[PDB]
């Protein structure tokens, strides 16, 4: 199929001052681009191995596939979760679900911040939808392990806590980044993803 | 391409009294048969996901692929590593490599037994060949993780320490099984695998 | 402080025909006994390493501590989760929570069975209580990884799917064991653990 | 015992232009300092749990202990592995061992670079000594998992490939960092660590 790097839905500087333009440009044009390129190389090798019945080769390719495939999945969602027009609080049924499942919007922010701050090493914090239980759920994922492929939860909002997501601007202080990012959450997109889950 | 269950190269009772016939029949005709069938099912699902560029589906299939594919890889080697004509010590260049890399055959036996006894949960102990270093090497693998796909070492001799490999006969006493298995190691096969590495 | 092997609260043959006496005696008097003894050995080594500030030694002991400590935690709960007086359905608030969180008791049984059947290698299926969300939750754990220590969920009902839990009687057919075990679930104990959570 | 942040054996700018002073200052005074502080907090909680026989609490503390304890172990070695007076090639028996085990010094550099470049996510590349085999060995470790505590190999030379080790200067281009770091390897320290392994 040949995966492609999706265009960013805004200018690299559109999320300033919360995420600076240098980070956005590196994150999209270098990090995400590399995931796409390496995913395409890995998928081609997997097709060769499947055609030959080389199970050893398939298994040896799994780390690169999950890492670059997961990186592509996660970053593709991440870009749509952010917006220069973002921030504030969601409305409608998503806000109702947040209050129901987490108590309040403020308590939800505390819980998702805590999950994202708690990642040791590289990883992601997620607000997801549990289809079987029919409610929201917070989870963390290591490295580039993607939410749906590894947990079954449908991703609604992801917070990248790899050092490349914040280090140039916030250095070691991940909590300052986690506080800033709330100003650019695209609740319109998160709402669209949530509504798609229900019926 | 479709993987197939290899026939056992000897009678189910050929390894008695070291591994009883009930274990051999269950291990081959039930456990390995399930791995092969589930591998073919997983590979077909992966081919579909690859054709659609569904990376989430590919990643969700990785555990089943490594588990069932590794199960097929490991057990296919295992049956050839055992023989009613086995036991004793290897000869020729394999024996020389064992003495060179481990000090003696007895010291090698201690190291492979220790790796196999040390597995917590299900897994395998392996004598492998390190192609880059050009020498033998011992490693342990969890569950059905196969040696070459996860470490790059070429498998020479594998010891299955899943409970289904010994429990009916030896119950919880894994060391009794490890002591018995040395009497049925097919050093002719281990030598063939070793000589193929040095080509 | 020294951990001790709890006596089984019933006869080794009390769960027949669902779990035979040979399994119960081996499972308790051999498998659990080894976990307790190895836990005490590991804890003593950890106390020495902590006193010396030997972080390398502490980290090297982590696998044995989680394996044997988890083994002790899990099996101590497991014996109380089973009873000759078991089977049937729970009553009162636990039944209400099951219907509320899973739809029905039968749907809950399907979800916990699926989690337990889905374990690849050794592990456990759990019904737990999520304190932060205030509701029930199903999770699976690998090897002897204990539920609360690794997920934060409070354990209510655990299903051991290590091969030593069923192999002598059910051989490779784990689903037959899972079908049988429902006849001996001690819902009185599961209810007590649940009520302690809502205090 | 109360672990302490070791003084750096040189000025924060002593490794320029290969690793800039801002990185060295953040890496030591923020990242390593945090590992030490969090290690001390975690060890105190572990002492409490050991005194109470709370195995659940001990296991829940394992991730923080390995992460911060491993971070302390790894960075303490890393600082001594570098020097403004470094670079070039080792001499004496260490050089003899490198030629013997890897073919040449240049081939060793290629192998350690490849292991360090190959880390997906956060981690480390290591040249270690295998006491049982009596020879050098290259390995990679994820996150802050320390070499000796998780593999048994004695650390000789470590290459930190966490993004915070290079990102401010080299951005996403880890290979440029891996090339530059060879100019500051303190082969006198690596030789001391190697000689300590033999007899
Ligand atoms: K016979
Ligand atoms: K009875
Ligand atoms: Mn990222
Ligand atoms: Mn097996
Ligand atoms: Mn058990
Ligand atoms: Mn570092």
CA of C33 to the centre of ligand 5 (A): 11
Neighbours of C91 (CB within 10 A): 11
Ligand 1 centroid, distance to B159 Cα (angstroms): 21
DSSP A108-144: HHHHHHHHHHT--SSEEEEEEEETTTTEEEEEEEETT
Most D CBs within 10 Å: which of B133, B136, B151, as the mutation test of the D interface?
B133
Q: Which long-range contacts (C-beta less than 8 Å, at least 24 apart) are formed by A191-195?
A: A191/A90, A191/A91, A191/A92, A191/A93, A191/A94, A193/A129, A193/A154, A193/A155, A193/A156, A193/A157, A194/A93, A194/A94, A194/A97, A194/A129, A194/A156, A195/A93, A195/A94
Under DSSP, the state recorded for A104 is: S
Q: Does A133 touch chain C (CB under 8 A)?
A: yes
Buried b (16+ CB within 10 A) or exposed e, A156-195: bbbbbbbbbbbbbbbbbebeebbebbbebbbbebbbebbe
Ligand nearest to the CA of B19: 1
Using CA atoms, how far apart are residues B192 and A189, in angstroms rounded to an integer?
60
Q: In what order do the strands lie in the sheet with D123-130?
A: D135-142, D123-130, D154-160
Backbone angles phi, psi at C137, to 5 degrees: -160, 140
Sheet holding B135-142, edge to edge: B135-142, B123-130, B154-160
Under 8 Å between Cβ of B81 and B19: no
Across A28-122, where does the E strand assignment appear? none
Task: Looking at C82-143, list the stretches that DSSP marks H as alpha helix, in order from N- to C-terminal side.
Answer: 92-102, 105-118
Cβ burial, residue A13 (10 Å; 0-12/13-18/19+):
middle
What is the C-alpha separation between B84 and B188, in angstroms, rounded?
Answer: 12
Q: Which helix (H) or strand (E) holds B123?
A: strand B123-130
Q: Are D83 and D184 in contact (CB under 8 A)?
A: yes
Check if the beta carbon of residue C134 is closer than 8 Å to that of residue C125. no
CB D80 within 8 A of CB D89: no
Q: Are β-strands B154-160 and B135-142 bridged in parallel, bridged antiparallel, or unpaired?
A: unpaired
Q: Which of C55, C68, C72, C151 to mutate to test the interface with D (most CBs of D within 10 A)?
A: C55
Q: In the β-sheet with A123-130, what is the strand arrangement from edge to edge?
A: A135-142, A123-130, A154-160
Report the distance separating Cα C160 and Cα C174, nearest Å: 11
Determine the Cα–Cα distance for residues A156 and A139; give it in Å rounded to an integer: 11
What is the A144 CA–ligand 3 centroid distance (Å)?
8
Of the candidates D119, D196, D111, D130, the one whose C-alpha atom is nearest the C-alpha of residue D165 is: D119
Tell me how far apart the alpha carbons of residues A142 and A124 are, in angstroms, rounded to a whole number. 7
- Residue B56 CA to residue A23 CA, distance in Å, equals 26
Question: Which chains have 3+ CB pairs within 8 A of A?
Answer: B, C, D
Residue C103, token pair as written in the block: 């739809």
Distance CA C169, CA C163 (A): 10
d(Cα A109, Cα A129) in Å, to the nearest integer? Answer: 16
In eight-state DSSP terms, residue C8 is: P
Closest CA to D75 of D124, D37, D121, D10: D124
D122 vs A30, A31, A121: nearest CB:
A121
Residue B134 makes CB contacts below 8 A (sequence gap 6+) with: none
B133 inside 8 A of chain D by CB: yes
Tokens 């987490």 belong to which residue? Answer: A102
- Cβ pair C174, C161 in contact under 8 A: yes
Structural contact between residues C164 and C31, judged by C-beta atoms closer than 8 angstroms: yes
Structure tokens at D117: 């470049």
Can you read off the two tokens belonging to residue D134? Answer: 């009596």
**Nearest neighbour of D55 by CB, restricted to C50, C52, C72:** C72
Contacts of D107 in chain B (CB under 8 A): none
Assigned CATH for D21-81: 1.10.287.990
Q: How far, in Å, are B125, C69, D108 from residue C23 at the CA level? A: 26, 21, 53
Please tell me chain D's helix, strand, coil percentages from 3-state DSSP, rounded to the nearest 5: 60, 15, 30
Q: Which two tokens stand for residue D190?
A: 């690596």
Torsional sign, CA C12, C15, C16, C20: negative
Q: What three-state secondary structure class fits D112?
A: helix
**φ and ψ at residue B157, rounded to 5 degrees:** -145, 125
Phi, psi of A63 (to 5 degrees): -60, -45
C-alpha to C-alpha distances, B34 to A102, B40, B75, C126, nearest whole angstrom: 43, 10, 11, 25
State the Cα–Cα distance between residues A23 and A12, nearest whole angstrom.
Answer: 8
Q: From chain C, pick out residues whose CB is under 8 angstroms from the CB of D47.
A: 50
Q: Which of A104, A120, A133 to mutate to test the interface with C (most CBs of C within 10 A)?
A: A133
D67 touches chain C (CB under 8 A): no
CB-CB under 8 Å, B150 with A59: yes
Compute the CA torsion angle C46, C51, C54, C55 (nearest 10 deg): 60
Q: Domain A92-197 in CATH: superfamily?
A: Iron/manganese superoxide dismutase, C-terminal domain (3.55.40.20)
Is D160 labelled as part of a ligand binding site? Answer: yes
Cα dihedral C159, C137, D66, A65 sign: positive
Nearest CB to B167: which of C142, C144, C164?
C164
CA distance C154 to C129: 5
- Rounded CA-CA distance B164/B44 in Å is 28
**With an 8 Å Cβ cutoff, is D101 touching chain B?**
yes
> What's the first-to-final CA gap in chain A, in angstroms?
29
Nearest to B175 by CA among B125, B114, B123: B114
- Which residue from B7, B177, B149, B173 is spatially nearest to B75, judged by alpha carbons? B7
Distance CA B49, CA B155 (A): 30
D102, closest residue in chain B (CA to CA): B133
B16 Cβ contact partners less than 8 Å away, ≥ 6 residues apart: none
Contacts of residue B7, Cβ cutoff 8 Å, sequence gap at least 6:
none
Integer distance in angstroms from the first to the last C-alpha of chain B?
27
CA distance B171 to C168: 9
Q: What are the start and end residues of each CATH 3.55.40.20 domain in chain D?
A: 92-197
At what angle are helices B92-102 and B105-118 packed, to 10 degrees? 70
> Comparing C-alpha atoms, which of C144, C129, C183, C110 is closest to residue C36?
C144
Chain B contacts of D133, Cβ < 8 Å? Answer: 101
Q: Are C122 and B122 in contact (CB under 8 A)?
A: yes
Q: Taking the CA of residue C174 as centre, how many other CA atoms within 13 Å lie in the half-sphere pointing to its CB?
A: 23
Q: How far is CA B76 from CA A130, B31, B87, in A?
A: 40, 12, 19
Among the partner-chain residues A50, A57, A146, the one whose CB lies closest to the CB of B59 is A146
Q: Which residues pair with D102 in a beta bridge?
A: none
Beta-carbon count within 10 A of A134 CB: 11
Encoding tokens for residue A37?
A: 């390129």
Task: Write out the DSSP string of A147-198.
Answer: HHHHH-PEEEEEEE-SGGGTHHHHTT-HHHHHHHHGGGB-HHHHHHHHHHH-
CA distance C56 to D128: 15
State the Cα–Cα distance between residues A93 and D86, nearest whole angstrom.
62
Tell whether B111 lies on the interface with D, counting CB pairs under 8 A. Answer: yes
Q: Taken in order A22, A27, A28, A34, is the CA torsion positive or negative?
A: positive
Q: CB–CB of A163 and D162 under 8 A?
A: yes
Distance from CA of D115 to the nearest CA of A (A): 14
Strands B154-160 and D135-142: unpaired
């Amino acid at each position: 199929m040949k995966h492609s790097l999706p265009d960013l839905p805004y200018d690299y500087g559109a999320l300033e001052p919360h995420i600076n333009a240098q980070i956005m440009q590196l994150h999209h044009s270098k990090h995400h681009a590399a995931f796409v390129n390496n995913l395409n190389v890995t998928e081609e090798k997997y097709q060769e191995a499947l055609a030959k019945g080389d199970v050893t080769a398939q298994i040896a390719l799994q780390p690169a596939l999950k890492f670059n495939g997961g990186g592509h999945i996660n970053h593709s969602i991440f870009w749509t979760n952010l917006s220069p027009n973002g921030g504030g609080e969601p409305k409608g049924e998503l806000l109702e679900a947040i209050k129901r499942d987490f108590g309040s919007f403020d308590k939800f922010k505390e819980k998702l911040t805590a999950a994202s701050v708690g990642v040791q090493g590289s990883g992601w914090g997620w607000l997801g939808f549990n289809k079987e239980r029919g409610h929201l759920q917070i989870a963390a994922c290591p490295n580039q392990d993607p939410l749906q492929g590894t947990t079954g939860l449908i991703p609604l909002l992801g917070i990248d806590v790899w050092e490349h997501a914040y280090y140039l601007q916030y250095k070691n202080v991940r909590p300052d980044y986690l506080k800033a990012i709330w100003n650019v959450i695209n609740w319109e997109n998160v709402t669209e993803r949530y509504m798609a889950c229900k019926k």
